[PDB]
Amino acid sequence: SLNVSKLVSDAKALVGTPYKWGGTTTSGFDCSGFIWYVLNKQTSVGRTSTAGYWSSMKSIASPSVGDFVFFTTYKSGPSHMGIYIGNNSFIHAGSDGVQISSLNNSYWKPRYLGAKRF
């Protein structure tokens, strides 16, 4: 339903934006606020937490480019998310900035919970 090319392009343009808990602006993002911010450029979508997007988005068995990937980090269940950009990579707002990371990373891989489609 989205423009996947624009979504990924808009996300990449934000690489390096620092972290802020609850952050929804280019002065600082958290992982779900980044997703909301890029989605809100094309459509209407309520700003919720990562667990909120895990529940509201559509289940898919593997991600395509433009889909969303979810991880368990500081708590059980989905607590971190990013946008799948292909090549086994995902872009996400993290404690040290919006970044591109690999699903094969030895930390992210065993914590990957699944993917959802907007």
Binding site: Y19, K20, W21, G22, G23, T24, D30, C31, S32, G33, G46, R47, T48, S49, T50, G52, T73, Y74, S79, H80, G94, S95, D96, Q99, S101, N105, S106, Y107, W108
Partner: protein, 153 residues
């Protein structure tokens, strides 16, 4: 009289208090009730603090041992805390524990009187480049405290 070892233990306490506050609840208070429900205010989505942090006074009293008075007030402002129907509320947000603060090292930046700044080099959990994080400690009520709510995450 704040060593690198002491400063790290303080920073770690700041981190815990910041996390608990932004998360709405001091997990030590088992009696707490967490008001459900969300609302929109000033183009942000809000959730309610749990009851143990349900008012600014309760939040201030939780944070006062570890953060300076102005650190706390600026924290409320920086994170858009609001009081709705007498209940403290915070915008929806997600923490991020990538920085492995317990494994960090510190360098002295500056000190004068009852203020000291250390720069922590904090490794990440995923092997992305380590992060530089400065923390300024100030003696308040003859206790060392962190002068910025969100310096340690």
């Amino acid at each position: 009289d704040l060593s690198q070892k002491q400063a790290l233990q303080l920073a770690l306490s700041a981190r815990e208090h910041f996390w608990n506050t932004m998360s709405g609840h001091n997990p030590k208070v088992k009696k707490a009730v967490c008001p459900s429900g969300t609302f929109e205010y000033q183009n942000l989505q809000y959730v309610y603090m749990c009851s143990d942090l349900g008012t600014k006074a309760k939040a201030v009293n939780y944070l006062t041992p570890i953060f300076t008075k102005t650190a706390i007030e600026k924290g409320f402002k920086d994170y858009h805390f609001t009081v709705s129907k007498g209940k403290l509320a915070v915008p929806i947000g997600d923490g991020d524990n990538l920085l492995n603060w317990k494994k960090s090292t510190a360098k002295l930046i500056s000190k004068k009187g009852s203020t000291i700044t250390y720069e922590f080099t904090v490794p990440t959990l995923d092997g992305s480049p380590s992060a530089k994080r400065k923390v300024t400690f100030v003696k308040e009520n003859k206790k060392w405290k962190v002068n910025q709510f969100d310096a340690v995450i």
